[PDB]
Amino acid sequence: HGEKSQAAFMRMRTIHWYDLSWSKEKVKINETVEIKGKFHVFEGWPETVDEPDVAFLNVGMPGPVFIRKESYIGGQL
Amino acid sequence: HGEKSQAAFMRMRTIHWYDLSWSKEKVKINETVEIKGKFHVFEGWPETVDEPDVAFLNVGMPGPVFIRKESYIGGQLVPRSVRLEIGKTYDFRVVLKARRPGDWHVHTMMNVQGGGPIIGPGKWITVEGSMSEFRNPVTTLTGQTVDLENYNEGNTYFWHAFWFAIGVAWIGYWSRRPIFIPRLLMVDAGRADELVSATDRKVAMGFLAATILIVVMAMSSANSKYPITIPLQAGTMRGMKPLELPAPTVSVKVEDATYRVPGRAMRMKLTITNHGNSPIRLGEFYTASVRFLDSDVYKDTTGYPEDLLAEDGLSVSDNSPLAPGETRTVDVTASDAAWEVYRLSDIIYDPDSRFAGLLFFFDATGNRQVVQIDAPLIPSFM
Amino acid sequence: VPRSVRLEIGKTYDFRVVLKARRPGDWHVHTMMNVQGGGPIIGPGKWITVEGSMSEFRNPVTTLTGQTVDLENYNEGNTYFWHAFWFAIGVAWIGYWSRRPIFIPRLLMVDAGRADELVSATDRKVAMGFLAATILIVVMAMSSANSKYPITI
Amino acid sequence: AVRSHAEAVQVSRTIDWMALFVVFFVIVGSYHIHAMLTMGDWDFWSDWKDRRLWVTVTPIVLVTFPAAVQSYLWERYRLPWGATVCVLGLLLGEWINRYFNFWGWTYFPINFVFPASLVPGAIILDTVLMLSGSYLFTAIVGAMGWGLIFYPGNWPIIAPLHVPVEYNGMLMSIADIQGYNYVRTGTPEYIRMVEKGTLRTFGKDVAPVSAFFSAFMSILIYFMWHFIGRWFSNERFLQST
Amino acid sequence: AIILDTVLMLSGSYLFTAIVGAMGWGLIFYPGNWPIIAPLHVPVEYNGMLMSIADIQGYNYVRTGTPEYIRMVEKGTLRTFGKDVAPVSAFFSAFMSILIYFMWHFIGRWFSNERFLQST
Amino acid sequence: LLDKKWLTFALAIYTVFYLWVRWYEGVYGWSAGLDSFAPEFETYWMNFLYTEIVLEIVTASILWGYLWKTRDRNLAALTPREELRRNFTHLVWLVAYAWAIYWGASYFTEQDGTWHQTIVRDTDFTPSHIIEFYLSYPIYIITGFAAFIYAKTRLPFFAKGISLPYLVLVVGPFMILPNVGLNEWGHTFWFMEELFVAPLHYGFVIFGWLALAVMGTLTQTFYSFAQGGLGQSLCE
């Protein structure tokens, strides 16, 4: 909900998300929903963005409407 | 013209320019001259120079005696800063259009964000004609062709003169009356409240309102005209394509390197091992824009600058053909007046007495091999 | 590697350090790697016994000017001489001004009326001599240290 | 002394012209040094005249001398043109150097090396001071206007240089092509401190945000330099150095 | 120190001292120490690398807490023109010495205060 | 008589000399002046530096010594008309100082925003530096010191004490000349970028600010003008 305001070229050349999947579209309280996919770090990383030497896998959401039980990059938490 | 003053070791170990070529040596006004070549980023990049993460392909010249029409690293245009990788070799091409008559020393240079200018070899290029004949046309995406020499000059002059006139009018309006000493005396001796009275306040209100209104109207008019504008295009460009050079079949180990103080010669002992399947011979030693050639092995035909070219400045103790698989150790002496003219002898003043360079090995058929050497450079006094 | 070096993460390097014994005793010798922005990385330490006398230690070195010096005491006499000379010059200046009464009478003279009496010729002449001699001695010493040791890096 | 009332008036007029010369050219020298060493690089190049750094920095560092000269001239003579005289002197020095050195000595085109316009901001600062003589009101409102009107004041000049051009496969503005073509050996492209985009640049806000930041910092710098000029006006006689 | 003191006593102006004497104080530092350190700058061919005698001293006499990279010394730049490193540093030090002397004259003026702060 | 034609000479000498200097640097900027190790650079710019430094030292010594030696001992017995004439002469000195300050701190300073921004430096003695710091700065320093000395030695208002604003106006712009050390140190070492707004320039700026003391100096000269011959007319 925070995109559509960032620069178009910066959204185009930072990180490409594909093979995205969602385990469920509608859930109950205490029920788990899993989001999977791949992201590719673009070679032409803009100089105005620091290199992703320190990066955090986050979730874009309006406050803790979900709690992040687990998050993995590769296969490790 | 800005080298010969930089540190000798820093000129030796930053960037090695080779295969340099110039399309023309003498040009007319509006004529194009193209500079091509390769540069290799040295692996032993000095720690005092920031890594070439942000680098710009520039031209060393005394002001816009040429205009840079195009510049390429790899095969793609590079109007912005670029990222270079240490140890990689890139090919470059700069297209220049003659603008000012005269004899100009044109250098190809690489500016590094945190290290300053790295000046390559410079070549004298003669320009003939008149500056008044120079044109720099360009066609915009709005479908109009303008000459960059004088485009917007009238508008700039007009607006600057208009605002200067407004300010001068304000100052003169207040300067018609006596200025300094009577006003100072009036302010000091009692309350002043007499030197600023209507219609002075009305004139100031008119000036303020007119200034704001004129700024708004001028901005609106400059938006109706030129309705299509873009911001300045900037940003370092990544993904420069380096040359995919074949692995050299020659390995060279430097066993000590010395230069006489004072002197115009550099001496080094190399252990050369010939792999592959052809007899090789040492033909060139390039250290910092200076090419020491063994004339019996190789001759320069690309019109390299004479003051940077040592036709027989490279003497090898045993430069007989090196059979494949054979390893021999020879004494190599690079001697030329350039070693002192370009102050490569002043490495004795440097806080890091290490040299780097390129050795060019040629076989009978003529195909060449480039190997890089770097070692401490030990002065000798007695 | 007498200077700092660049290491690559994930790479394995082999190292070799040659040490010459200088001081008798039992010493715990560690091989360590100092990183510019992380501090000391100390490797395993081994007890190494040194026997003898420190007075027997020599650290000879041969320069490119063709002279062999012992790094234990080379230039020590020259350093001591120059430091003592300049310290003596400063002490002479201070003592010259300290022969007369120093603090309370001078303070009273400065406070009560204009002083203009505690600094009079030939005090100004002595100060001019001190300044000129200091500059001249510095210049002459630099020139002499340039004639000797004409080759420096 | 003076012979009569008329001769006193003539002497005062001559003093007025001579002291105006002294004020104007000492201000030219000092203000030009300060400006060219605090905003000169942006002021030198049309391809440096961007929407973020140029708009931000220039009013902030250029409000310095107008504040001090105002705090002196208005307070001591009720002359409301300190800001205007500072800006006019800076523009005169800058234009003289651009024409005789940038274009005269070197041969950079004037449409490439033109300076920025500052008279609208100076006029706002001077009129807002004369009306409502409050220096605090000036520092708050007039400095706000000085910061805010900078970019709109210069837009008629630089707008034609922002026409997009398809240049050898890459999109470039006319100012970009000027900077590319007219080689500055000592000034590589990366030195250019211009807007380059960020992931936190929301919508079309680069110019207004920079203008408002410059206006606020201009308020602060004007407040500081009013008192700096108050000190510089001191008529004290330091008995001994 | 002698330059600073004599330039103050002669021409008692503190401003003149801060300008001229501090200039001399900054400028004479390196020439004053050159007779001491010059013998330590004799070049030596040390195990294939060029090193000064001071460099060999720092290499040999191990400072466990002081690695070589901590050394803030001249390392060369691409904008180091000719043989100017020492004079340029000396003149910069002299100018900054003028500034610091000017500041610390008034700092010492304050530190001399004979006031009686009635309560702490 | 009062204000005489010394003002015309004060303007004209600086104008003509600096126009000739500009012509000289236009002729020898390129072509003996680009390469700092060429022999022609020594004959056209190093010789210029040496000659200008020697001439500046000699001129400063002679001018300041003459102004101090011809100082008015009996300032008390100075008529108001003579005081007015001396005030006008001091104003001419201030005009010369303002003109020299302009030429030094605006023209030849920004003339560098034109020399380096275009060429790759080769030394601490760029022909332009041989013009700005070793001429556009010593000349205005000499003029400012001469004006200050003239005020102190001929004007009773500026006598009996050192005026703080005049001292600042005279010495601060002088401090720009020793600040060249910071310029050099922070060009070769700190900052290889030709950034004109680099912190290695807050040295001419800080001391360029001290020229704002001309405001206090000029109100002091106004009071000195309005001592005995203040009028009447003014405030009457």
Ligand SMILES: CCCCCCCCCCCC(=O)OC[C@H](COP(=O)(O)OCC[N+](C)(C)C)OC(=O)CCCCCCCCCCC
């Ligand atoms: C006379 C009183 C009534 C007028 C009141 C005006 C309210 C604001 C108008 C916004 C215009 C617009 O359009 O939004 C803002 C426009 C860009 O617009 P966009 O590209 O559409 O932005 C997309 C996002 N949106 C759709 C939500 C707008 O620029 C700006 O980012 C300006 C940012 C300024 C920040 C600093 C302000 C400091 C104020 C200090 C006060 C003392």
Ligand SMILES: CCCCCCCCCCCC(=O)OC[C@H](COP(=O)(O)OCC[N+](C)(C)C)OC(=O)CCCCCCCCCCC
């Ligand atoms: C005392 C207050 C005086 C204010 C005077 C304002 C005159 C009109 C300006 C129109 C600007 C415009 O047209 O929009 C904003 C544009 C930038 O637009 P951009 O998106 O970067 O694109 C650039 C390309 N253009 C021009 C083709 C779109 O200009 C500016 O940067 C001005 C920013 C400051 C605005 C100040 C007004 C808001 C209220 C101030 C009081 C709190």
Ligand SMILES: CCCCCCCCCCCC(=O)OC[C@H](COP(=O)(O)OCC[N+](C)(C)C)OC(=O)CCCCCCCCCCC
């Ligand atoms: C106490 C202070 C009160 C000030 C009230 C505001 C007066 C605005 C006058 C009109 C300006 C205009 O219309 O132009 C401003 C332009 C809009 O730019 P744009 O929307 O991007 O595009 C151009 C769109 N046009 C062509 C339709 C204009 O620049 C800006 O982005 C600045 C907008 C931010 C204004 C912040 C004001 C905050 C006030 C807070 C009070 C509590």
Ligand SMILES: CCCCCCCCCCCC(=O)OC[C@H](COP(=O)(O)OCC[N+](C)(C)C)OC(=O)CCCCCCCCCCC
């Ligand atoms: C009594 C009056 C007459 C004497 C006037 C002296 C003029 C300068 C002499 C230069 C000596 C020389 O040789 O040049 C300079 C020598 C190095 O020389 P290089 O290695 O050959 O440089 C190669 C390039 N060249 C051939 C063009 C010289 O060091 C320096 O870089 C010194 C730099 C100092 C910078 C800061 C100075 C601040 C001054 C402040 C004043 C208040």
Ligand SMILES: CCCCCCCCCCCC(=O)OC[C@H](COP(=O)(O)OCC[N+](C)(C)C)OC(=O)CCCCCCCCCCC
């Ligand atoms: C009131 C002013 C008093 C000045 C006293 C000067 C005494 C003589 C110094 C000779 C220096 C030398 O020999 O040349 C310069 C050398 C550095 O040389 P280097 O290239 O780094 O090599 C080093 C190895 N050497 C020595 C074998 C070559 O020393 C310096 O760093 C001193 C720099 C400051 C010089 C100050 C004089 C210039 C005018 C000052 C007034 C504006």
Ligand SMILES: CCCCCCCCCCCC(=O)OC[C@H](COP(=O)(O)OCC[N+](C)(C)C)OC(=O)CCCCCCCCCCC
């Ligand atoms: C208002 C201030 C006036 C001062 C005038 C200058 C007096 C110089 C005395 C002799 C010094 C000398 O000869 O030695 C200085 C040495 C030269 O070093 P070198 O050339 O590298 O090598 C050694 C070569 N020798 C052995 C032949 C000397 O150090 C320097 O590099 C400093 C040189 C920069 C001087 C800058 C002065 C700028 C003055 C500007 C006036 C408007």
Ligand SMILES: CCCCCCCCCCCC(=O)OC[C@H](COP(=O)(O)OCC[N+](C)(C)C)OC(=O)CCCCCCCCCCC
């Ligand atoms: C505050 C006190 C300031 C003191 C410093 C003054 C510096 C003066 C210039 C230094 C020259 C130098 O050093 O160079 C010496 C130059 C080198 O040129 P050349 O190769 O002989 O060619 C032939 C000469 N042309 C190229 C000039 C034609 O020749 C000269 O003899 C001529 C110097 C003339 C200077 C006097 C005229 C100034 C303009 C008229 C209004 C005053």
Ligand SMILES: CCCCCCCCCCCC(=O)OC[C@H](COP(=O)(O)OCC[N+](C)(C)C)OC(=O)CCCCCCCCCCC
């Ligand atoms: C009593 C208070 C006085 C203190 C002032 C003393 C001078 C400080 C000397 C710094 C040496 C140091 O500390 O380190 C030196 C560091 C080491 O960096 P590097 O790894 O070589 O970076 C390599 C980058 N090059 C290649 C460009 C160097 O270079 C610096 O970053 C210099 C920082 C500038 C500090 C000087 C600012 C002077 C302020 C002038 C404003 C009027």
Ligand SMILES: CCCCCCCCCC(=O)OC[C@H](COP(=O)(O)OCC[N+](C)(C)C)OC(=O)CCCCCCCCC
């Ligand atoms: C509480 C803060 C709200 C804003 C008010 C801040 C202004 C305060 C300035 C001040 O201290 O007073 C100075 C003058 C005094 O002049 P007066 O003789 O009071 O004139 C009154 C008639 N007048 C309305 C036309 C001005 O009066 C003025 O400064 C001008 C008053 C008119 C307001 C508009 C002037 C500013 C124009 C941009």
Ligand SMILES: CCCCCCCCCC(=O)OC[C@H](COP(=O)(O)OCC[N+](C)(C)C)OC(=O)CCCCCCCCC
């Ligand atoms: C870059 C910072 C801007 C510089 C502004 C700082 C000015 C500081 C004020 C000052 O200089 O005080 C002078 C006193 C000496 O006092 P006296 O000479 O006794 O004068 C009597 C009257 N007085 C005490 C009020 C001065 O203190 C002294 O010891 C004399 C030193 C005077 C030096 C001031 C000259 C500044 C030129 C840069």
Ligand SMILES: CCCCCCCCCC(=O)OC[C@H](COP(=O)(O)OCC[N+](C)(C)C)OC(=O)CCCCCCCCC
């Ligand atoms: C315009 C700036 C040019 C430089 C002048 C700055 C000096 C000003 C210092 C000052 O305010 O005056 C203090 C003393 C007063 O002593 P006097 O009683 O005037 O002595 C005059 C005889 N004398 C020439 C031997 C000095 O006089 C002196 O300070 C000494 C005057 C002699 C100059 C050389 C002294 C400095 C040696 C390095």
Ligand SMILES: CCCCCCCCCC(=O)OC[C@H](COP(=O)(O)OCC[N+](C)(C)C)OC(=O)CCCCCCCCC
């Ligand atoms: C690191 C910075 C250097 C420290 C220098 C700062 C000194 C500030 C001056 C100061 O302390 O003022 C004392 C006043 C209390 O005044 P009183 O005790 O009423 O004394 C009457 C006379 N007097 C007002 C002039 C002091 O204010 C008070 O409330 C008493 C506080 C006194 C603390 C000073 C001791 C500083 C030791 C570090």
Ligand SMILES: CCCCCCCCCC(=O)OC[C@H](COP(=O)(O)OCC[N+](C)(C)C)OC(=O)CCCCCCCCC
């Ligand atoms: C090539 C160098 C030539 C410099 C010539 C200096 C002239 C001598 C300075 C001088 O004392 O006064 C010259 C004029 C007229 O003032 P005078 O009345 O002659 O000065 C003494 C006042 N007194 C007669 C009542 C005792 O006062 C002026 O306004 C002359 C201004 C000259 C401009 C400054 C040139 C400095 C260039 C470095």
Ligand SMILES: CCCCCCCCCC(=O)OC[C@H](COP(=O)(O)OCC[N+](C)(C)C)OC(=O)CCCCCCCCC
């Ligand atoms: C270089 C940086 C300057 C540092 C600033 C310190 C000077 C600021 C205060 C000042 O100018 O006063 C010195 C005198 C003014 O008269 P006083 O300071 O009252 O003392 C007069 C006696 N004295 C000439 C020995 C000083 O003014 C003069 O007498 C100067 C003319 C005499 C000097 C002529 C010889 C210099 C040749 C190079």
Ligand SMILES: CCCCCC(=O)OC[C@H](COP(=O)(O)OCC[N+](C)(C)C)OC(=O)CCCCC
């Ligand atoms: C208020 C500062 C005036 C600066 C004018 C200037 O730098 O003039 C040099 C420039 C040089 O260009 P140009 O006139 O074509 O003559 C070229 C001669 N050189 C190359 C030696 C400068 O133009 C002039 O000489 C015009 C005369 C103006 C008199 C106030």
Ligand SMILES: CCCCCC(=O)OC[C@H](COP(=O)(O)OCC[N+](C)(C)C)OC(=O)CCCCC
């Ligand atoms: C009043 C504002 C001063 C801000 C100082 C500044 O902008 O410094 C930038 C610089 C950052 O260096 P950078 O801009 O990356 O320089 C790039 C070019 N090199 C690496 C050759 C210096 O930081 C420093 O080195 C410390 C400055 C101390 C100021 C008292």
